[PDB]
Ligand binder design. Structure first.
Ligand code: HEM
Ligand code: HEM
Lengths: 137, 137
């Protein structure tokens, strides 16, 4: 289930983080405009960029912490607040998070692992609800 | 589902509030001690008493508002705080609440009306967690 999936991802975090984020950026290539130096590169060229692996692992480290503190796929409001008030997220709206979770759920359903992809879908929708409550447009 | 159940209960709130509260007291008779004015009265005698119907509906009105504001049966931290810090709930521990929800779920499963009882069980478990957090021993 959801709680086990957190353990699975954490068990090979940088691999899952890069693969899921790549799924996101491939599904929604115009999302790369929020990042620097990601456009014009294949998957193997992003993976050999140092910043890409490091940053993307930090993103999923935090995502897993937010998932782990949730109850029944409902994140803490303090965690939503953090994600809204991060300088690095100042250009974002909740739609950017919706796209991320659509791609993440799609990746899980295509994978060879026994993920609880409906729970990740509930978590994404609940996180978008919480980001809205915390004042993200 | 759970939202429909809130609608069902609200539609005939005096009736459900009184029936569920009496199911609670009749399953856990020792709990009647907290309601000094209800000692020594049958189900049918309590209903003729103004503050019985009026305070029991207020109890269940608040329960429904907490239920309605919940996400995926997880109540708001602020609503848990309200229930802990009511003068009327000063002596209570979380076990009192756990007994109420055991009785409420039993009532739902016994009824002719079609309730999402495992969701109420979950809600109760999540409310007890939140109450503890908010300082109820
Ligand atoms: C729950 C979802 C998300 C979590 C937990 C999250 C977490 C993070 C963390 C921890 C950083 C800092 C990375 C570092 O400094 O190394 C970061 C930076 C950033 N995030 Fe997110 N993020 C999430 C969703 C998004 C989405 C959906 C977008 C855009 C589509 C986004 C855009 C950015 C940008 C532009 C930066 C700064 C640029 C960069 O690190 O290269 N975030 N986020
Ligand atoms: C989610 C669960 C509950 C909610 C929403 C709730 C709500 C309330 C509300 C709104 C009142 C004020 C009634 C009024 O004065 O009109 C009240 C009073 C009271 N409650 Fe609770 N209650 C809950 C659970 C419990 C439990 C589990 C106990 C004890 C086992 C308890 C014991 C009392 C007592 C002794 C009073 C004072 C009697 C009265 O005011 O009529 N309640 N409750």
């Amino acid at each position: 289930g959801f709680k086990q999936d957190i353990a699975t991802i954490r068990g090979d975090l940088r691999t899952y983080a890069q693969d899921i984020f790549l799924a996101f950026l491939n599904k929604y290539p115009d999302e790369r405009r929020y990042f620097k130096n990601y456009v014009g590169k294949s998957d193997q060229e992003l993976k050999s960029m140092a910043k890409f692996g490091d940053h993307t692992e930090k993103v999923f480290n935090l995502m897993m912490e937010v998932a782990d503190r949730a109850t029944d796929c409902v994140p803490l409001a303090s965690d939503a607040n953090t994600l809204v008030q991060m300088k690095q997220h100042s250009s974002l709206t909740t739609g950017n998070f919706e796209k991320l979770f659509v791609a993440l759920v799609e990746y899980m359903r295509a994978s060879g692992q026994s993920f609880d992809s409906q729970s990740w879908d509930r978590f994404g929708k609940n996180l978008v609800s919480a980001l809205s409550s915390a004042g993200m447009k």
